[PDB]
Write a protein that binds this ligand. Structure first.
Ligand SMILES: [Fe+3]
Length: 54
């Protein structure tokens, strides 16, 4: 699965790690994250992330 990075702060969403603290289980693909999720570190919306990977 692709990693994604927050373009506001550089946080990396890693799908193996997820963001469980905010309801995104480890193992969740970025496209499957609910679209009201925000970056755990700076609060930016999901739509300010972009792929690292492909
Ligand atoms: Fe961020």
């Amino acid at each position: 699965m692709k990693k994604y990075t927050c373009t506001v702060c550089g946080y990396i969403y890693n799908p193996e790690d997820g963001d469980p603290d905010n309801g995104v289980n480890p193992g969740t693909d970025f496209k499957d994250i609910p679209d009201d999720w925000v970056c755990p570190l700076c609060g930016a919306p999901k739509d300010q992330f972009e792929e690292v990977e492909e």
